[PDB]
């Protein structure tokens with residue numbers, strides 16, 4: 001019944017910054033929600049802990065989840081390397097939207113992005129599966145280490161992650 005909640009504890013070159021928590025819309029995109037949930041707990045023996053936000057563009061989005069190549073060329077899902085676009089019921093309405101990154105139709109893995117602006121042109125192309133619940137102020141703090149081309153001026157990591165009540 002109830003939508004799961006996950007947290008990232010963010011660090012900036014090793015220094016604790018704060019926590020971001022997310023509602024995962026399991027009621028609408030269960031397969032996509034379950035992937036990100038599992039990768040956040042690490043329960044399949046791999047996932048997000050210790051990985052970085054490799055690409056951050058202020059006034060656009062923070063991208064991470066590439067735990068295999070650390071630079072945006074990698075990652076994998078709990079279902080195999082890639083998995084289908086589940087649906088496009090949810091839209092990119094504004095800051096805080098959590099959505100899957102991809103390389104074409106039906107190429108979801110582990111990489112994800114947190115919107116820091118409305119990104120409506122991604123509607124129907126990237127699967128929206130969650131949203132920031134607490135710690136949008138921490139996402140805005142992160143965003144300040146990004147740049148126009150998305151290279152970060154400091155190393156933004158998920159020092160820890162998991163599932164909350």
Ligand SMILES: CCOC(=O)CNC(=O)N(Cc1ccc(N)cc1)CC1CC1
Nearest residue numbers: 072073101102103107108109110111113
């Ligand atoms: C705002 C979200 O932007 C994207 O997902 C744009 N594309 C990527 O980030 N890619 C990187 C990527 C690679 C593998 C996966 N699973 C996801 C993204 C695709 C590159 C051109 C080939």
